[PDB]
């Protein structure tokens, strides 16, 4: 099976430089183009440029030539791209994908988030929203006061069809909030426990929050 | 090499056809001519390669055609899954070039939203900060409107509001509405109603919850 596996998400200061990772597995990595490309919240995608690492050459958008390095090392089958002298709008989702036939983009890693900000890595609190004192039964949790994207959300519970709705985060202040609800059968809850999961891989923090009802 | 992408947001019904252009600037040869399809969170998939070959599973409901400058990605009979942003790109010339999109929306009976409210934590009552959470989950058209009440006048500063795109299953939408005051804020006042307006009730739609009652 072909994997390109990127680096995590990262915060990273205005002025200075950011380098990320793409690791290749399952196929001959020195036979294909690797190509690199950003995305900013709700815009299409621009290429930065490619790493062929059959002979170390790299070909850039002459718009990211000064500001993008992309490298490979041969030995752990890992493309780099390195940008420097950031600013607010490097903010964005970088993917690595492999050059296929007629240069089509067939494999795509998962995407590595990138903040260029100012404010400090902070990890979420977490809060459990159940119902103030039916068949079914909504509840919560509510993701506040984290930086940088993103968070995860998993649920433990009995959720229903279409039952399980987790928010696109907000920014205030240098802090997001997020939601995530989920509708449950009231045979199930408080009778079988339910938590929300969170996870904050830019702080290295996860939360296990049991929903718990109000006394 | 600009391509535009034309529409730039539209809906279809399931079992009509769908057909979506890219307009290059500039004549692009086929065979360096692909469309991807991406859906909210998820990296982009080879949907199309050299204008009209399927990548391995796409549907064969999905066709290309194209030269030149004009290409297009047909959907003969829209499906729920077929909800997503497509991308055309070309390949021609360094750099290579991608669309801005359609966003491919899925028409579905209309919704009422399941109104639901929720207390500050406690857990939050020990922060300084008091958060209340309305949830309007399962509504169809996207259009709403969202008031909070509190002891029966309108608050607007501290509600954060985001949306969910089309759920997977039933292709509605959902919404969060978030109150924040600060502690002191929130233990001044009783009730906090949330009122959602959508085009399915003549009436909103409305929970409270009550300091007193719990
Ligand atoms: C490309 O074509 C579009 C649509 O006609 C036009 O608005 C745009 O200005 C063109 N861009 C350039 C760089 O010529
Ligand atoms: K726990």
């Known amino acids: 099976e072909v994997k390109l596996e990127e680096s995590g998400p990262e915060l990273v200061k205005p002025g200075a430089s950011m380098k990320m990772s793409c690791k290749a597995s399952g196929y001959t990595f020195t036979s294909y183009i690797i190509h690199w490309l950003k995305q900013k919240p709700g815009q299409g995608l621009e290429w930065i440029g490619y790493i062929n690492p059959y002979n170390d050459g790299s070909k850039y958008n002459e718009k990211f030539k000064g500001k993008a390095t992309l490298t490979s090392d041969k030995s752990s089958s890992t493309a780099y791209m390195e940008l420097s002298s950031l600013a607010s709008e490097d903010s964005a989702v970088y993917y690595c994908?492999?050059?296929?036939?007629?240069?089509?983009?067939?494999?795509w890693g998962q995407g590595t988030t990138l903040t260029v900000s100012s404010a400090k890595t902070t990890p979420p609190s977490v809060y459990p929203l159940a119902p103030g004192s039916n068949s079914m039964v909504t509840l919560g949790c509510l993701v506040k006061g984290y930086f940088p994207e993103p968070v995860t959300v998993t649920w433990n519970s009995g959720s229903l069809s279409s039952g399980v709705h987790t928010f696109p985060a907000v920014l205030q202040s240098d802090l997001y909030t997020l939601s995530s609800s989920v509708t449950v059968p009231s045979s199930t809850w408080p009778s079988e426990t339910v938590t929300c999961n969170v996870a904050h891989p830019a702080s290295s923090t996860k939360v296990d929050k049991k929903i718990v009802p109000r006394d | 090499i600009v391509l535009t992408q034309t529409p730039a947001i539209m809906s279809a019904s399931l079992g009509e056809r769908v057909t979506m252009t890219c307009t290059a600037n500039?004549?692009?040869?086929?065979?360096?001519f692909h469309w991807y399809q991406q859906k909210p969170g998820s990296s982009p998939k080879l949907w199309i390669y050299?204008?009209?070959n399927l990548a391995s599973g796409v549907p064969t409901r999905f066709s290309g055609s194209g030269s030149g400058t004009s290409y297009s990605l047909t959907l003969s009979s829209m499906e729920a899954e077929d909800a997503a942003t497509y991308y055309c790109?070309?390949?021609?010339?360094?750099?290579?070039?991608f669309g801005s999109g359609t966003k491919l929306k899925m028409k579905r009976a209309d919704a009422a939203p399941t109104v639901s409210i929720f207390p500050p934590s406690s857990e939050q009552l020990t922060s300084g900060g008091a958060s209340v959470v309305c949830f309007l989950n399962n509504f169809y058209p996207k259009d709403i409107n969202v008031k909070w009440k509190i002891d029966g006048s309108e608050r607007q500063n501290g509600v954060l509001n985001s949306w969910t795109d089309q759920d997977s299953k039933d292709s509605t939408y959902s919404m969060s509405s978030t109150l924040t005051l600060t502690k002191d804020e929130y233990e001044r006042h009783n009730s906090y109603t949330c009122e959602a307006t959508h085009k399915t009730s003549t009436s909103p739609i409305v929970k409270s919850f009550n300091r007193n009652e719990c």
């Open positions: 790109h070309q390949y021609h010339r360094s750099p290579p070039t």
């Open positions: 994908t492999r050059n296929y036939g007629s240069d089509s983009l067939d494999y």
């Open positions: 050299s204008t009209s």
């Open positions: 500039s004549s692009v040869s086929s065979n360096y």
